[PDB]
Amino acid sequence: DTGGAGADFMGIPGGAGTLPPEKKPQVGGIFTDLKVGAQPGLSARVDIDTRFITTPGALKKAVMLLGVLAVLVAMVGLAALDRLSRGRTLRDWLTRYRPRVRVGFASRLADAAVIATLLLWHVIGATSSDDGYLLTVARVAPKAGYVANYYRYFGTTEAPFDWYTSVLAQLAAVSTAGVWMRLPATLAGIACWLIVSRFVLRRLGPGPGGLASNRVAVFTAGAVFLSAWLPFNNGLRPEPLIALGVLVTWVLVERSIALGRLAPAAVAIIVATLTATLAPQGLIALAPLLTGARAIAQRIRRRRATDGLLAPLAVLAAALSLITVVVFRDQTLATVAESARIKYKVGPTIAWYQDFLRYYFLTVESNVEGSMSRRFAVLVLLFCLFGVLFVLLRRGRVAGLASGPAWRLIGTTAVGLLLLTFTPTKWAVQFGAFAGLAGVLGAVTAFTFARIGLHSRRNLTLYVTALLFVLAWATSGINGWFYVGNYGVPWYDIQPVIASHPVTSMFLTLSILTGLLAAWYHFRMDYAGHTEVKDNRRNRILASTPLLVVAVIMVAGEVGSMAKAAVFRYPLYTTAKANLTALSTGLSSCAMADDVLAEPD
Amino acid sequence: DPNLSPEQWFAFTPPRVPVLESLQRLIGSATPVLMDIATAANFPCQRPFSEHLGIAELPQYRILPDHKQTAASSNLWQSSSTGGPFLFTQALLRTSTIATYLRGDWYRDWGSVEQYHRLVPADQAPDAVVEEGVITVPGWGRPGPIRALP
Amino acid sequence: GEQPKAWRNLRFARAKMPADAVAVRVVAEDLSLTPEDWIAVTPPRVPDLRSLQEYVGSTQPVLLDWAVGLAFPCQQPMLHANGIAEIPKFRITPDYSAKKLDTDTWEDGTNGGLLGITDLLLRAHVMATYLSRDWARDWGSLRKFD
Amino acid sequence: IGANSSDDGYILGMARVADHAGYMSNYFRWFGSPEDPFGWYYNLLALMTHVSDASLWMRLPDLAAGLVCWLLLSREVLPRLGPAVEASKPAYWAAAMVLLTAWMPFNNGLRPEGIIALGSLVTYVLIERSMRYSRLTPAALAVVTAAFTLGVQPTGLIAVAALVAGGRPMLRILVRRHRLVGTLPLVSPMLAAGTVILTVVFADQTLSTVLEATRVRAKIGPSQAWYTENLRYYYLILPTVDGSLSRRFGFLITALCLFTAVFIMLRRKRIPSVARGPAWRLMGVIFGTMFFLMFTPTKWVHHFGLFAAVGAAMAALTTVLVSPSVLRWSRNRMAFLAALFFLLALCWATTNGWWYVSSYGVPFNSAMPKIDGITVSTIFFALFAIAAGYAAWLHFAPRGAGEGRLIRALTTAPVPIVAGFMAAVFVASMVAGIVR
Amino acid sequence: AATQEEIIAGLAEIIEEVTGIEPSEVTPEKSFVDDLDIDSLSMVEIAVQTEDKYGVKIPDEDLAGLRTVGDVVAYIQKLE
Amino acid sequence: RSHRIARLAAVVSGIAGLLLCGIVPLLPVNQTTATI
Numbered sequence A: 001d002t003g004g005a006g007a008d009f010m011g012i013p014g015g016a017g018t019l020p021p022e023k024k025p026q027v028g029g030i031f032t033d034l035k036v037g038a039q040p041g042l043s044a045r046v047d048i049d050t051r052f053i054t055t056p057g058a059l060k061k062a063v064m065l066l067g068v069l070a071v072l073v074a075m076v077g078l079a080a081l082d083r084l085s086r087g088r089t090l091r092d093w094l095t096r097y098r099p100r101v102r103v104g105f106a107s108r109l110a111d112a113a114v115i116a117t118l119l120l121w122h123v124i125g126a127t128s129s130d131d132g133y134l135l136t137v138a139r140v141a142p143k144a145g146y147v148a149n150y151y152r153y154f155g156t157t158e159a160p161f162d163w164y165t166s167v168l169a170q171l172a173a174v175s176t177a178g179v180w181m182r183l184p185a186t187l188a189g190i191a192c193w194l195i196v197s198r199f200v201l202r203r204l205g206p207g208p209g210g211l212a213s214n215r216v217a218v219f220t221a222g223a224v225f226l227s228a229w230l231p232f233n234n235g236l237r238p239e240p241l242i243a244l245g246v247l248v249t250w251v252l253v254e255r256s257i258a259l260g261r262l263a264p265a266a267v268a269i270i271v272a273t274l275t276a277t278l279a280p281q282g283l284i285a286l287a288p289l290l291t292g293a294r295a296i297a298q299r300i301r302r303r304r305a306t307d308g309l310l311a312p313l314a315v316l317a318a319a320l321s322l323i324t325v326v327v328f329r330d331q332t333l334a335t336v337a338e339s340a341r342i343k344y345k346v347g348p349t350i351a352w353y354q355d356f357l358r359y360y361f362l363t364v365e366s367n368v369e370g371s372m373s374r375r376f377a378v379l380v381l382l383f384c385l386f387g388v389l390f391v392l393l394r395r396g397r398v399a400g401l402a403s404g405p406a407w408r409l410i411g412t413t414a415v416g417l418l419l420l421t422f423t424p425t426k427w428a429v430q431f432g433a434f435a436g437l438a439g440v441l442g443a444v445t446a447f448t449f450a451r452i453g454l455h456s457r458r459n460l461t462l463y464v465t466a467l468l469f470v471l472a473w474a475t476s477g478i479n480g481w482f483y484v485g486n487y488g489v490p491w492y493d494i495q496p497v498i499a500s501h502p503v504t505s506m507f508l509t510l511s512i513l514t515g516l517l518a519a520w521y522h523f524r525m526d527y528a529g530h531t532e533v534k535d536n537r538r539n540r541i542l543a544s545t546p547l548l549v550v551a552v553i554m555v556a557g558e559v560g561s562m563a564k565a566a567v568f569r570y571p572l573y574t575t576a577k578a579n580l581t582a583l584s585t586g587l588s589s590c591a592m593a594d595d596v597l598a599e600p601d
Numbered sequence B: 001d002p003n004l005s006p007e008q009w010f011a012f013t014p015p016r017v018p019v020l021e022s023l024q025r026l027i028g029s030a031t032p033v034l035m036d037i038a039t040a041a042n043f044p045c046q047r048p049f050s051e052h053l054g055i056a057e058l059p060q061y062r063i064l065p066d067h068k069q070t071a072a073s074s075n076l077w078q079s080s081s082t083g084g085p086f087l088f089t090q091a092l093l094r095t096s097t098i099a100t101y102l103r104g105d106w107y108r109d110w111g112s113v114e115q116y117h118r119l120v121p122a123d124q125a126p127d128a129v130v131e132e133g134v135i136t137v138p139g140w141g142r143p144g145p146i147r148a149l150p
Numbered sequence C: 001g002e003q004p005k006a007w008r009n010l011r012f013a014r015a016k017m018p019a020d021a022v023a024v025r026v027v028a029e030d031l032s033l034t035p036e037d038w039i040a041v042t043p044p045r046v047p048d049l050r051s052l053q054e055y056v057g058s059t060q061p062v063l064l065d066w067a068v069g070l071a072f073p074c075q076q077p078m079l080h081a082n083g084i085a086e087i088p089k090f091r092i093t094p095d096y097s098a099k100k101l102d103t104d105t106w107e108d109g110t111n112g113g114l115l116g117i118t119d120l121l122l123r124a125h126v127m128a129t130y131l132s133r134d135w136a137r138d139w140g141s142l143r144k145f146d
Numbered sequence D: 001i002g003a004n005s006s007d008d009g010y011i012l013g014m015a016r017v018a019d020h021a022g023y024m025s026n027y028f029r030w031f032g033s034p035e036d037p038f039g040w041y042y043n044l045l046a047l048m049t050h051v052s053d054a055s056l057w058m059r060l061p062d063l064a065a066g067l068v069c070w071l072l073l074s075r076e077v078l079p080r081l082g083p084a085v086e087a088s089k090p091a092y093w094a095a096a097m098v099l100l101t102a103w104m105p106f107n108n109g110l111r112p113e114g115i116i117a118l119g120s121l122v123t124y125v126l127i128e129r130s131m132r133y134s135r136l137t138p139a140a141l142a143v144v145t146a147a148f149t150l151g152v153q154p155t156g157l158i159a160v161a162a163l164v165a166g167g168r169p170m171l172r173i174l175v176r177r178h179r180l181v182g183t184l185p186l187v188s189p190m191l192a193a194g195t196v197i198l199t200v201v202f203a204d205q206t207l208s209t210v211l212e213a214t215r216v217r218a219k220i221g222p223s224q225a226w227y228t229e230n231l232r233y234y235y236l237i238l239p240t241v242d243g244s245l246s247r248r249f250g251f252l253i254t255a256l257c258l259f260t261a262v263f264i265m266l267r268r269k270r271i272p273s274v275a276r277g278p279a280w281r282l283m284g285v286i287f288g289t290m291f292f293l294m295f296t297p298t299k300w301v302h303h304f305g306l307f308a309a310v311g312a313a314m315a316a317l318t319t320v321l322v323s324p325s326v327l328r329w330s331r332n333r334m335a336f337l338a339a340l341f342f343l344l345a346l347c348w349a350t351t352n353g354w355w356y357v358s359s360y361g362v363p364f365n366s367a368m369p370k371i372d373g374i375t376v377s378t379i380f381f382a383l384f385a386i387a388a389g390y391a392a393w394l395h396f397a398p399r400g401a402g403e404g405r406l407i408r409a410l411t412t413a414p415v416p417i418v419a420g421f422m423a424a425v426f427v428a429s430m431v432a433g434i435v436r
Numbered sequence E: 001a002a003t004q005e006e007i008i009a010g011l012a013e014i015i016e017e018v019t020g021i022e023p024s025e026v027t028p029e030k031s032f033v034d035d036l037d038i039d040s041l042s043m044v045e046i047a048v049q050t051e052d053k054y055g056v057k058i059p060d061e062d063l064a065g066l067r068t069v070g071d072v073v074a075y076i077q078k079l080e
Numbered sequence F: 001r002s003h004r005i006a007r008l009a010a011v012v013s014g015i016a017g018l019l020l021c022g023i024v025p026l027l028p029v030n031q032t033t034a035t036i
């Protein structure tokens, strides 16, 4: 039993013996060598653990209902308070006054080109690592009685982070194909792009200026979104959901700050605590709440003469304490604590002071986990973050871009990259939760560097040499995917070469030459001017498309590799043939168990 | 063999023209299998072994990834000192190997398949008749730790 | 201690047992039934312990590793004049982990190195050495070439 | 009483055998190949070994180099970033303490890092002196200094950063002197001066010999590519002896100040009495150093000893830029203090280990400090959490919340105090290893 | 605080802070919907941020009749 | 007065929803046993 493990020949003095409680056997049967009857006194009684097979009961099912009813009533009351404060009479509840504004033809043409690519990549995709893991967990969970790990940690649960696996377990009962189980990860990219293109680019500069009327700054957003979404988010991993929860939280916080209301700010807390329980790297969804908190405190203290200081805070706390109904629907506090203890004692965990071997796992030698087109999506993110940060520190304005939303976007990205420190695991695939922010940061960079780089030439040259240096860093790892996506890819084990000569040097020489030209302009400005670059019609669109071109050629290189593999090796097995065979013939086809031959004897 | 180093030799065996059959006809999507982590999204018809009431069901086959993947990840993630299925698929079963090829692609080192035989045959060591009940426990009690030791 | 199969020469300080101690004796148990938990012993002895500046002189050629050159500043390393090297008499080495990970791989024979000469004609063997009062500290090694 | 480097027995053994062989060989790894595109400095230790090969006598150049670095730093570099860096005691104390704590763990053995760090400062000084009287002679001596610094070690590809930094206000001198005396007696002397290191490099060897040695060293030895630079920083965050609490601080305290001075000098264009332009060349030098450190064959942590003389001059500038007179709001100063506490918590999360025989007796040589069961990085993290909590409270505050004498006092000079505490820890380690 | 000394000198700052539109092109003859591009969200944000500077309640059933920026002038003049 | 009701329906049902959803992880649960 617990706290003791012993043996005792009864009628013998020196027979007794006892051991510590970690000297417990590893029962896998009872294998005697006796073969003697069924005498009295011969027996054995094993008690299996079965501590994670709990079900709510009489209580914990009435409280789990009264709680959500009270929360909904509280939020309705707060919404009524919001409607009363704006001169309304809570009878014209959301009756619009201003007419609807249309969508330009350039913004309806990037949607058709991003959704088409997200649909094409769903059939010829890459199928990242943790797909078999989650698929097996979801196929086993219905009969086990709970969501077990099944591969490690002594059959322990996944108690906090298992509300997405409980939906995968419902999808894996209709069919377990690959084009059916990976539908949420695609709908969460379609929605994540629609939200961006319909709200975020219009919140940042809604006028006759730019970022809503500039057409190149929309195609740049599309291309960077695709280049950051394709290499990371295609499997069953929950990154495509965190990338959407972050944008939904940002949108609701911005709506609350703009309209002067508090109910969207209380739904943002619910969405944030719902995203924070998808994976330990879901803390990123709590960054918009931290950045846009002073503008909410100003609103709470502005209207405290009509209502009080307790009415909004009660709701803002009740909404935060609602995630318990979803976490402990079963698996009481004891089992969650035990599961966490087991996962920390066993298993690879990394301490917070080694948070910087996450950018080492990305930029390392061969490591298909740190391949080309994964370095690009992160280096461009950092480049467009720090460029806009510098252009906002110097010259506080941008004159065509609202500064409140821009500062909050920069803050969201920075606080997310700083909150990734306390995650227990430091893989390189966890950078896929920034795909939504990458698009808007690329759009903002393409917009700013087009006007601050038109009144000078050295800035226009520094932009290009920095892009070439990023390309030199990117094209120095292999072009590899996980296990079967590598079947036919051009450079899946070596770095890209043209004619026995690597490209990572052909880009570094160009970077050096362009930097020398920039220094030449810097020196020559002592005997001439620098603003003489006339923007007639050609120089207009030549400083706004250095990033669009790079992102487009990278997306084309990611798509053409898989397309070329699929088309060139046929009928040989490839991960696109399996999907195109499962699409036809109903949905019943064994993917690889039919292209594999075996010799029984 | 003209080289005189002590580590150069090959020791061959006579040739054969094998008689092949698909893996779907061999395993059959009805027997318990132990797919590894990598080779589990590519075989969606084969079913993994279940774990009902804390007792596992012994598999009959095993599908592995390639050599560089198995040596690096699959063998040391699902260990027995860490709680994986090797806890009981190494103390109760004996493994073998089957010669498998990838159709049309004779240069490809995909995976491998292995068969499992009982150490104690089930004609004298049958399965258990484990009982079942129900109790009511509070939400703060904890009846000692799980022996999560290596 | 972390290398359980090494013929490791355990040591017991005489200054800890009382002044008037007449005898000693070895006691070994091995209560573990694992096939790889075993024990082996030899009788106890009282060494003679001369110094290292007196055994290894100041004129004999020594092969000092590249990590141990500033602690032994009087030991006369082995020289080379016209492509021909000298034949050493001893080799001084760092402790176990350093010797295994740094020096034996830096100067091995497949990448130049001096351990490509001494491996073909010298046939080294290790000696018994201690620090003067750090009985539980590993200072390095000392080999002899035959 | 101080510790030594790892490459001391190496250089001593290959300098003791270099008068019999007749050339400076490596003697340990490659096929007897010399080191003679570089290594004019080892031919000086080969001469010093004639007197004696003691330890106090062989590491005299590394002491004279540090003394001359302080003499140049405190008297030519600091009274140049304006009348606020000088006439300020915390700035001088910060420079002194950072110089000490960056020269202690790295630049004490026989490696030439301490000589490269001095040759990289003499160049900066000579250039900043050339562009003060519009003369060309110091700008011709800086080229000789940079050449002789590059001829010491492959990592000596710095002071080229110091040449490039002062490049725009040097063209204003070249051009305005080109109008007086022709153009040939300006590129003849500065060609003869720059191309004189070849007579010292190929004084013994020839061209074919240097080419063969290079071919061997490149085909065999550890020679990483420019895109594997992240190894230098990966080796620094591991809990080993190659990266410990004594070898992290010197680089972290430099990176923190370098990155916090840029954000202030970007927003605030004109700062009173700071003399903009030398303050920007001082950061250009450090960025160019970090960029030129990328094209080196070997990526070791030993090469972080070159920032011992520019980091010391960056700390003295940051100590003035973050003072209660330049950074006026309490939230920003509390944020800087919290960043310092975070840096300390990250630095103390490793062992106190030194090298081969310098680790005999030092207390926490193989584990984390862990005062009374709880580590010290946890204590510094608690302090960081408290300081960040106060900064976050000052964020939501009516602009005049924290202005008392307590938080005005504890935010006047935190860098000198932290660096002095670390230097006292370093000295106590060796004293406690000598006593017991 | 009578007319044209804050009536535009603060409105052209609120509009710039909210939409990024330069204050050089905020003159009292052009309407929000025609010359500028101001939707419902920006209109309500302007009406909310103008209540913090010069506290005057602009209800939501009121900014439907402020067609031009000069209409805001006339309205807040009527309030004065 | 349509303001007092809307102010009480956000305090009462906020405190209740904070105190009810905060004790869910500490309520009795039905566990299954197994014995061989």
Ligand SMILES: CC[C@@H](CO)NCCN[C@@H](CC)CO
Pocket: C102, C106, D006, D007, D010, D011, D035, D111, D300
């Ligand atoms: C693995 C040992 C490394 C130094 O850590 N040796 C570097 C070689 N030392 C140079 C002289 C210091 C060679 O010229």
Ligand SMILES: [Ca+2]
Pocket: C030, C031, C032, C033, C034, C035, C037, C038
């Ligand atoms: Ca035994």
